[PDB]
Design a protein around this ligand. Structure first.
Ligand SMILES: Cc1ccc(NC(=O)c2cccnc2)cc1Nc1nccc(-c2cccnc2)n1
Length: 275
């Protein structure tokens, strides 16, 4: 649109500028398609919404949030289409898909110990940025991260609580929650803070260290809280360095105030990234 007009929005773009293909099949994100931005011949990801009227308000609050955040490890917003009907939200396309499947299907000789540490450092960087910005993620997990060329990893948020066709998001009052990634206080008092993101990050670390295994393997959801209260915690994965595991442990402190901040977690990783 024209800079001469009330509410000019630099993010608004013209639909005709993008060629729509078919949905993105990875774990499949619902109404998100692969598209091309003719101008730059770029493949992009386009989340749509046209008949799901219930979202509009929420689909729009999402767009607004993404305009407020910028970081090399956060999926980069390219443009929106929040004017005419078929609403869009264009993002960059990450060549290798979500991090969970990536870890499960990768060549482990290539994605070695040093690459896993690199991936965790990138994520903690994005989270340190969000911590500084006073933004809360609420659904940090490998399924929500994306992988690019050269093991570039970016944090995103696919609003998957709706997709869950399995055991990942157990229902809780019209609101689905990924119980095994949720901190104690978030399960008990429904209190979400940046410290509960730190708890989720600890679980994300476990996912990476195991190349994508499911948290608390074998244990049923209904006993996860009780177990945690009795001080039960996942054990150091096979081949997981002691320093990394000790960090996992700090992220799982029962009292959120005892959990490290993402700033110190990021510093710990950079340092550790030595050698
Ligand atoms: C198209 C799109 C629309 C909105 C958001 N939003 C967010 O990621 C987000 C971040 C922070 C807060 N709220 C929302 C992200 C995207 N990107 C997006 N969505 C699903 C799959 C993929 C995808 C899959 C495979 C390869 N590359 C990208 N990308």
């Amino acid at each position: 649109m024209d800079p001469s007009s009330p509410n000019y929005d630099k993010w608004e773009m013209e639909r005709t500028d993008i060629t729509m293909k078919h949905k993105l099949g990875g774990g499949q994100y619902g109404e998100v398609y692969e598209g091309v931005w003719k101008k730059y011949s770029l493949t992009v990801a386009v989340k749509t919404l046209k008949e799901d009227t219930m979202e509009v308000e929420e689909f729009l609050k999402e767009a607004a949030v993404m305009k407020e955040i910028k970081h090399p490890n956060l999926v980069q917003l390219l443009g929106v289409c929040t004017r005419e009907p078929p609403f869009y939200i264009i993002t960059e396309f990450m060549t290798y898909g979500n991090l969970l499947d990536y870890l499960r299907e990768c060549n482990r000789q290539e994605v070695s110990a040093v690459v896993l540490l690199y991936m965790a450092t990138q994520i903690s960087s994005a989270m340190e940025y969000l911590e500084k910005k006073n933004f809360i993620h609420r659904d940090l997990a490998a399924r929500n991260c994306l992988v690019g060329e050269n093991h570039l990893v970016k944090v995103a948020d696919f609003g998957l609580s709706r997709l869950m066709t399995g055991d990942t998001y157990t229902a809780h009052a019209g609101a689905k929650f990924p119980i095994k990634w949720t901190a104690p206080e978030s399960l008990a008092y429904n209190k979400f803070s940046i410290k509960s993101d730190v708890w989720a990050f600890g679980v994300l670390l476990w996912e990476i260290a195991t190349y994508g295994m499911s948290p608390y393997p074998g244990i049923d959801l209904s006993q996860v809280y009780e177990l945690l209260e009795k001080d039960y915690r996942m054990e150091r994965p096979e081949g997981c360095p002691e320093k990394v595991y000790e960090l996992m442990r700090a992220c799982w402190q029962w009292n959120p105030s005892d959990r490290p901040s993402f700033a110190e977690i990021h510093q710990a990783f950079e340092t550790m990234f030595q050698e």
